[PDB]
Symmetry: C3
Subunit: 240 residues, 3 copies
């Protein structure tokens, strides 16, 4: 029985659509202005393609929630629902975030991080659709993909959290707080959801992910964008 | 009721399969011969990977119509139909065209153009499968993705439509005629199709897209290929 | 009627999961140690991203068989089966192998090889799901994609099978034996399977592919990894 306040879920996703996509539009707006706060012709004249992943993820997530709002506003499972099959939305955005983060600090093993998160989500997608005792087997299969990735990412972050000046170090620090504080929240919610323990009802499950995706895309993307501006101001505007 | 001349639709797709794929085979045939009309060892000996997207798109589209012909020749919706779920075919080819066009003139924002068309098609794919009033909401969601992309592409084309010599400028001009004259034809057909207004029956809907895809893949790809030959003849064969 | 020894098929896939993924873990283990057998700081300190495709394919295939084991252990077609729709698993791994092989020897036409195998598998995926006389039409469509690719790959291999020293030439030779001896085995099995002639029952069909995927991913990947070590030892450790 999925009797729940669908217009409320549609309203939240509509609000999340405006904020995440609106931040994405601003995110691309500030990219093609200069190296940082000061406007510069950006050498050739075009920003690097690796510096525009943060904005597109929000727009990709912004239109993702718009489609979910249409599913929720209708009052059931639309053919193009994006909500009936869980976590299929994050299969495309989440591997872009770590790749976007990898290019920001020039982290190594960018391809490994992409497939670690791509396969973590797909294992999770398999968990929701399987209504058997092997749903936790896929979850266990997902967790043994995410855990080595999370611990390997944290290490390479600590190495790079040593040369950046304190001006841009705070922006990197808050990005990691969103990273390691809210990415592990998705597996935790699955355990306690109606699929696992049962503490969290399905209606409240959508709402938490709506706020998590604000944090993981828009707010994390804003932190990355401001971090790039401070980084390029200190290096390519100050020479140091 | 989908009572329509399926063998006619299969015959058209079979004919479209031969022409588009046949052009693609020629497209890759002329690439590995030299810089342009005159044969040159191409420096290293291999053509750049970015210069072979035009041919593969036609082969990808050529085999795409072969699968549609099998669906039409059977006389219904085959399990691997490629026609029951509309525009799922263009989700992979259309984002390759703008990326192929972007690499040809070295347009900036190549990643943004890819996702603008990738998400334009997916929003359109969502429109066909949803049999509710939100089908036009997905169409409105698709149009607000395509329109900024179309206007931003046109601008960066005008900037590059200033340095090319008139010999290769005509090839670029006709590519843009196919670009901005026939890409906007796909959204227009959706409004007037049986899903929207109802002017165009479903049987005639396949036929128009069969000719549009000839123009958008094979004919547009031929224009791009000839444009590259003239471009490289003037630059890397003449020194100017 | 699919009455077959499902726990046996689950056990084989579980065993294949451990070996392929275990080899993949070792494959990435030996990459970040040095150029070859001798440990070297690898210039910058990080291995090239193109040198880590072999390990990830095995991990991608290792987790692929784990999901199949869950489907087989359950005793039927799970919602996330990976076995009900055939060859959908290889759509992602097989195009990575030829791309991984292309980067190893710096083969040209890397993009063409990727789409040749990507479209060969998709045409094959269409063959299994279509229960009509056009299943062999998709197979014929797949074979006319694979055959030009197989013959073009063989040629460019012969050109590169001339400069490598005999120390690493044996590793390349055995990689080609796995390449041209076992990749053509997949189309051959389809003809003689229960879909085609009928010699091979469905129960025995999974088992052969389980051993083929060991050879095509783990054993082929091991051959590629050892080949890289000998190649880099002779070039970047010996100077020759
Ligand atoms: C919009 C921008 C998106 C950008 C990125 C998109 C990529 C993500 C792809 C999303 C795939 C979406 C699949 C969603 C399937 C949802 C199926 C579903 O909702 O089933 C439930 C529902 C039952 O609900 P009720 O009938 O109301 O029951 C109550 C009794 N009155 O069943 C149905 O409605 C029937 C579903 C019709 C067929 C579904 C067609 C799905 C759309 C196909 C396009 C996606 C192509 C995917 C490629 C693989 C090819 C299958
Ligand atoms: C060939 C080269 C292709 C290269 C690139 C390919 C990428 C594009 C992927 C295309 C996905 C194709 C999905 C097509 C689904 C079509 C479903 C369909 O036709 O339903 C209609 C039809 C009803 O018609 P009738 O029975 O005749 O009614 C009349 C009464 N006698 O329903 C059916 O036939 C049942 C369909 C069987 C299941 C469909 C299986 C689809 C094939 C799955 C492979 C695709 C994998 C996609 C990945 C996501 C996993 C789902
Ligand atoms: C785990 C790591 C994976 C990493 C890479 C993954 C990428 C590959 C994607 C794999 C797609 C998997 C699709 C598998 C569909 C299988 C459908 C199936 O099994 O049907 C058979 C089965 C009939 O069997 P029985 O009922 O037992 O009959 C006996 C009588 N008692 O039918 C069912 O069980 C109903 C199926 C429920 C719906 C299936 C939902 C599939 C999961 C969707 C997630 C995949 C998203 C794909 C994107 C396109 C959107 C559709
Ligand atoms: C619907 C089914 C679709 C499934 C199709 C699967 C096809 C797989 C798609 C491509 C696989 C990814 C391989 C891409 C090649 C990797 C890029 C490359 O060659 O290296 C370029 C270069 C290498 O570094 P160097 O130049 O040596 O730096 C020296 C230091 N100054 O790039 C880099 O710097 C590292 C960053 C590379 C990009 C990071 C990886 C991103 C890859 C995206 C994967 C897409 C997967 C799609 C789904 C997969 C399903 C299995
Ligand atoms: C089935 C579900 C599958 C979904 C999986 C989604 C994974 C996403 C796959 C990869 C995402 C794309 C990121 C690729 C990295 C971008 C390439 C890069 O790093 O830059 C290399 C380099 C950067 O430029 P510079 O060297 O700085 O030029 C200086 C001027 N002389 O490349 C360029 O020149 C620009 C062209 C880059 C390629 C254009 C973008 C193409 C990306 C393909 C996207 C594939 C998406 C797949 C589906 C997405 C679903 C959400
Ligand atoms: C769910 C539906 C998803 C479908 C979305 C389809 C989007 C397509 C995704 C990207 C398409 C691939 C285009 C990638 C751009 C090609 C890379 C490029 O620009 O060149 C970089 C550079 C070019 O060579 P040079 O630098 O000139 O060497 C000089 C010699 N010293 O790279 C190379 O060296 C060659 C290797 C390039 C990578 C090989 C190709 C891999 C592409 C992966 C394709 C992914 C397809 C995804 C599914 C497709 C579905 C249709
Ligand atoms: C716990 C409460 C959470 C509330 C949700 C958050 C709401 C969004 C507010 C921003 C959150 C992230 C901000 C990250 C910190 C950056 C703030 C900042 O100060 O940035 C500046 C400058 O950079 C910026 O401008 C970034 C801030 C811009 C954020 C824009 C907000 C998002 C845009 C959405 C607009 C569209 C929304 C549609 C309406 C919503 C309808 C529901 C950096 O320099 P300073 O530290 O100030 O030092 C001064 C000297 N340089
Ligand atoms: C409104 C009527 C539309 C008719 C459909 C179009 C039919 C295809 C004909 C070509 C259309 C696109 C042509 C674009 C313009 C290029 C023509 C051209 O002249 O190219 C040359 C040279 O480049 C070329 O050769 C390109 C033309 C090659 C086109 C090959 C036709 C497509 C190949 C398909 C063969 C397989 C078809 C299978 C049979 C079909 C069965 C149904 C450029 O140099 P010139 O301007 O002539 O100046 C001379 C000094 N340099
Ligand atoms: C017909 C029987 C087939 C049996 C299946 C194969 C079993 C796996 C055994 C390895 C097969 C591939 C080996 C390829 C040849 C490499 C062997 C080798 O000698 O490598 C060395 C060194 O490189 C290596 O070490 C590669 C061999 C490492 C293979 C590791 C085996 C795979 C790892 C799986 C461990 C996890 C498995 C989980 C348990 C399985 C549970 C079911 C190269 O140098 P040399 O020729 O010896 O000259 C000496 C001076 N240099
Ligand atoms: C309470 C929830 C929201 C967050 C839980 C995770 C927190 C505690 C984690 C994630 C981000 C983290 C940081 C990651 C990186 C570094 C750099 C290192 O050289 C010093 C510690 C340090 C600074 C971390 C300390 C604690 C940290 C804040
Ligand atoms: C009638 C249908 C087929 C086509 C409709 C769109 C037409 C009118 C558009 C698309 C291609 C276009 C061109 C795009 C680029 C340029 C370069 C600019 O510096 C002068 C005008 C100019 C040359 C355009 C004029 C008109 C144009 C031909
Ligand atoms: C968002 C900006 C860029 C505008 C682009 C979206 C436009 C073109 C879309 C959104 C609203 C649309 C309408 C949605 C609903 C209908 C009812 C249908 O039976 C006839 C066409 C019709 C009337 C549409 C035609 C075009 C339309 C105006
Ligand atoms: C019997 C099954 C397993 C394998 C069938 C295919 C075999 C016969 C093929 C695939 C790998 C092949 C090799 C591919 C490349 C070369 C390099 C060339 O300069 C000499 C011959 C040579 C060395 C081949 C000879 C035969 C070969 C071994
Ligand atoms: C480990 C694990 C999971 C991890 C989910 C993650 C990490 C999601 C991140 C989402 C983001 C980053 C959105 C933006 C699942 C799928 C819940 C279940 C399987 C085990
Ligand atoms: C804006 C828009 C659309 C645009 C379609 C396009 C632009 C298709 C191009 C096809 C090509 C280029 C094939 C080759 C849809 C999906 C009709 C509907 C949603 C609104
Ligand atoms: C030509 C052909 C085929 C080729 C299959 C191949 C070549 C598979 C390779 C698998 C690998 C390499 C796994 C690792 C099919 C799909 C059987 C059927 C259609 C015709």
């Amino acid at each position: 029985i999925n009797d729940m306040d669908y217009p409320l879920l549609g309203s939240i996703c509509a609000v999340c659509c405006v904020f995440v996509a609106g931040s994405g539009i601003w995110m691309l707006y500030r990219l093609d202005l200069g190296m940082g706060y000061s406007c510069k012709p950006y050498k050739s004249g075009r920003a690097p393609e690796v510096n525009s992943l943060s904005g597109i993820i929000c727009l990709l997530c912004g239109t993702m929630y718009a489609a979910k709002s249409f599913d929720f506003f209708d009052g059931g499972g639309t053919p193009f629902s994006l909500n009936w099959y869980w976590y299929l939305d994050y299969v495309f955005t989440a591997p872009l975030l770590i790749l976007d983060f990898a290019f920001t600090l020039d982290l190594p093993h960018k391809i490994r991080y992409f497939f670690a998160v791509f396969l973590t989500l797909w294992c999770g997608v398999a968990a929701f659709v399987t209504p058997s005792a092997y749903r936790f087997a896929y979850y266990a299969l997902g967790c043994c993909w995410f855990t080595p990735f999370a611990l390997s990412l944290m290490r390479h972050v600590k190495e790079r959290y040593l040369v950046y000046p304190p001006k841009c170090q705070r922006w990197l620090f808050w990005a990691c707080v969103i990273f390691f504080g809210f990415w592990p929240m998705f597996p935790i919610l699955f355990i306690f959801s109606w699929l696992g323990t049962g503490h969290i009802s399905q209606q409240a499950f959508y709402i938490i992910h709506a706020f998590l995706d604000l944090t993981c895309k828009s707010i994390f993307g804003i932190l990355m964008t401001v971090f790039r501006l401070e980084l390029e101001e200190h290096t390519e505007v100050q020479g140091l």
